[PDB]
């Protein structure tokens, strides 16, 4: 009933959108180049969320050909109307705006319904048995009516608002309250200028008048300059079960030199919204890591195990691949291990490697996995990658050398630099566990064999940040295998993956 910590969904979880279905809440984030796409969460209190799935789970729903951290799936919106859930988003590397739908969030969602109106950040609003679509073609928020089952546009597109004048007017959502249509948007860009603004009109098609108190949420001003949270925006308003009001939004946690490696994460703010008043977010349009505020009655949910095993023969919804995966290269062994089949595709090829990953969700964490490389030719490797983009990743691996010898290697890829930090000979026998630790300043790398941990050294976090590397994503920690020999049939078994955040 009182108190929570932000972010409510840590790590790479941007552009949150939320809907209420009775006493259940469902939330979606953008996923860019990763498959499956559009993680789907469930909560009873808005504070604790369980990843129950992903909306885009089949290749036919999600073409990721040549997708990267600056493309693929952009902001999604989720809405619930008359027993049907709708997830509407843009595939920027593919065919653009579309939705998928289902009567059961945990099931396989529909095939894509492709939509006519352009721009990005498509969103839906329902009234009087009609479905209204907004999006932002040419930097104008445009409104139309659609049949959401067929994708047919039923009225012409009308321009309605283009914000208060801030850059990149986007993330439009319509709500109706107290006889007003409210249009909530983001301005200022998704970096340090991010801000939430709002306007209203008696008519859905305008004219919209901006809140004299805009912006309603931002850390861009003097009031936010000292905050460890920055870039607050891309919000979605939602009603509490007790009649209170809330917004979910994106933001990020800054690091020395103005860097962020954990991506844009999902945050929660209380909203005062009296009858016939404009909404006010958390008194002064800011948020904090510790939120000492009343809440809906709190119910804890299932989270990431500290030791994930592969005995059930299914990866959880949290695991993600690069672009569309070669599904045959991920298999489960008789004795319940994850088996990755090698291909020659490296982590710098801008194509899908045999690679499967979990989002890093804490500044301070330790991740590890045992690695059993088998049937390997010389230079074949398997291990863990701290991965931001195809040109920006740190690789820790067991490599097959000549004469049945092996070694542990540590390779940093940063644009034109491919830097071998360490190459250390392994003992002929002994199961190797690879270990990656971090704090806000460094990644630390090591390996454990025969009960002894060896330090391989450290590398700066900043070179993998969004500010350095570009794109719209966060660091993921990936298990991978790459072959680099004649006709290799190499594979590697991973018995578990350990992750613990401080
Ligand atoms: O986070 C990806 C895009 N950034 C701005 C826009 O609102 C989003 O779709």
Q: Which of 303, 333, 351 is the last residue of a domain?
A: 303
Q: Is 120 in the pocket of ligand 1 (CB under 6 A)?
A: yes
Nearest to 359 by CA among 455, 462, 478, 470: 478
Of 28, 75, 171, 250, the one to substitute when testing ligand 1's pocket (max ligand atoms within 8 A of C-beta) is 75
Give this entry's resolution in angstroms. 1.8
Q: With residue 188 as reference, give the H or E element that holds it.
A: none
Q: Distance, CA 51 to ligand 1 centroid (Å)?
A: 21
As given in the structure block, the two tokens for residue 294 are 């009343």
Whether residues 299 and 331 fall in one domain: no
> What are the residues whose beta carbons fall under 8 Å from the beta carbon of 427, sequence distance 6 or more?
449, 450
* One domain for residues 403 and 486: yes
Over its C-alpha atoms, the chain yields an Rg (Å, rounded) of: 23
Q: Residue 137 in 3-state DSSP?
A: helix
Of 303, 335, 364, the residue that ends a domain is: 303
Closest CA to 12 of 469, 369, 495: 469
All residues at 6 or more sequence positions from 216 whose CB lies less than 8 Å from its CB, including other chains: 196, 197, 198, 278, 279, 280, 281, 285
- The 10 Å CB-count burial string (b at 16+, else e) for 441-475 is eebbbbbbbeeeeeebebbebbbbbbebbebbbbb
**Phi, psi (deg, nearest 5) at residue 222:** -50, -40
Bridge partners for 198 per DSSP: 184
15 is annotated as an active-site residue:
yes
What phi and psi values does residue 6 have, to the nearest 5 degrees? -105, 150
- Residue 270's CATH number: 2.115.10.20
> Three-state SS across 251-295?
EEECECCCECCCCCEEEEEEEECCCCCCCEECCCCCCCCEEEEEC
Same domain, 219 and 235: yes
Strand residues in 122-264 grouped as ranges (E) = 123-127, 130-135, 141-146, 158-161, 170-177, 180-187, 195-201, 209-210, 217-218, 229-239, 245-253
Q: Tell me, using a 6 A CB cutoff, whether residue 15 lines ligand 1.
A: yes
Asked if 188 and 267 sit in the same domain, the reply is yes
Whether 13 lines ligand 1, by a CB cut-off of 6 Å, is: no
Question: Is 54 strand, coil or helix?
Answer: strand
Catalytic residue among 121, 170, 389, 395: 170
Give 325-333's long-range contacts (Cβ < 8 A, gap of 24+): 325/35, 325/352, 325/356, 326/352, 326/354, 329/354, 330/354, 330/356, 333/493
Number of domains comprising the chain? 2
Contact 229, 267 (CB under 8 A): yes
In the three-class reduction of DSSP (H, G, I as helix; E, B as strand; rest coil), residue 296 is classed as coil
Which structural technique was applied? Answer: X-ray
Distance 495 CA to ligand 1 centre (A): 37
Q: Is 481:465 a contact under the CB 8 Å cutoff?
A: no
- CA 435/CA 365 separation, integer angstroms: 11
Residue 57 CA to ligand 1 centre (angstroms): 21
Contact present, 230 and 190 (Cβ < 8 Å): no
CA 227 to each of CA 6, 14, 235, 393: distance values in angstroms, whole numbers, following the listed order = 13, 19, 19, 29
CA 161 to ligand 1 centroid distance, Å: 18
Tokens at residue 41, please? 């969460």
H/E element holding 467? helix 466-469
Q: End of a domain among 268, 303, 338?
A: 303
Are 223 and 294 part of one and the same domain? yes
Residue range(s) defining the domain that contains residue 246: 1-303
239 and 332 fall within a common domain = no
């Amino acid at each position: 009933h009182q108190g929570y910590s932000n972010p409510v969904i840590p790590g790479f979880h941007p552009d949150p959108s939320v809907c209420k279905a009775g006493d259940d809440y469902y939330l979606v984030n953008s996923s860019f180049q990763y498959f499956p796409g559009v993680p789907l969460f469930h909560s009873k209190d808005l504070v604790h969320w369980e990843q129950i799935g992903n909306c885009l789970t089949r290749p036919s729903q999600l073409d990721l050909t040549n997708a990267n951290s600056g493309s693929g799936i952009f902001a999604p919106t989720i809405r619930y109307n008359d027993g049907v859930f709708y997830m509407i988003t843009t595939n920027v590397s593919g065919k653009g705006n579309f939705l998928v739908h289902t009567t059961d969030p945990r099931s396989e969602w529909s095939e894509p319904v492709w939509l006519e109106q352009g721009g990005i950040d498509p969103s839906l609003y329902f009234e009087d048995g009609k479905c209204f679509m907004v999006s932002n073609p040419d930097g104008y928020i445009n409104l139309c009516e659609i049949d959401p089952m067929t994708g047919k546009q039923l009225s012409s597109s009308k321009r309605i608002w283009n914000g208060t004048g801030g850059r990149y007017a986007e993330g439009p959502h319509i709500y109706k309250k107290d006889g007003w249509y409210y249009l909530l948007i983001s301005e200022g860009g998704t970096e340090l200028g991010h801000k939430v603004t709002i306007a209203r009109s008696r008519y859905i098609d305008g004219p919209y008048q901006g809140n004299p108190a805009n912006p309603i949420l931002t850390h861009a001003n003097e009031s936010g300059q000292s905050s460890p949270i920055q870039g607050t925006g891309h919000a979605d308003l939602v009603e509490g079960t007790d009649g209170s009001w809330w917004m979910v939004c994106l933001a990020y946690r800054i690091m020395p030199g103005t860097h962020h490696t954990l991506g844009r994460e999902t945050y929660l703010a209380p909203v005062r919204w009296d009858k016939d008043a404009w909404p006010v977010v958390n008194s002064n349009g800011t948020i904090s890591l510790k939120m000492d505020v009343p809440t809906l009655p709190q119910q804890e949910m299932k989270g990431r195990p500290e030791r994930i095993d592969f005995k059930e023969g299914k990866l959880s919804p949290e695991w993600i691949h690069l672009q569309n995966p070669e599904a045959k290269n991920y298999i489960f062994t008789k004795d319940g291990k994850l088996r990755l089949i090698a291909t020659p595709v490296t982590l710098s090829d801008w194509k899908s490697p045999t690679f499967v990953a979990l989002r890093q969700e804490h500044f301070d964490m330790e991740a590890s996995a045992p690695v059993v490389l088998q049937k390997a030719g010389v230079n074949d490797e398997a291990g863990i990658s701290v991965f931001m983009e195809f040109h920006s990743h740190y690789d820790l691996f067991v490599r097959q050398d000549k004469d049945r010898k092996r070694s542990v290697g540590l390779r940093y890829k940063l644009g034109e630099i491919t830097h071998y930090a360490k190459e250390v000979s392994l003992p002929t026998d002994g199961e190797v566990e690879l270990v990656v630790k971090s704090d806000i300043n460094y990644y630390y790398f090591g390996y454990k064999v025969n009960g002894i941990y060896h330090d391989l050294g450290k590398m700066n976090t900043r070179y993998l940040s969004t500010e350095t590397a570009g794109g719209f994503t966060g660091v993921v920690l990936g298990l991978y295998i790459t072959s680099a020999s004649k006709d290799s049939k190499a594979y590697a078994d991973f018995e578990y993956f350990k992750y613990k955040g401080k």
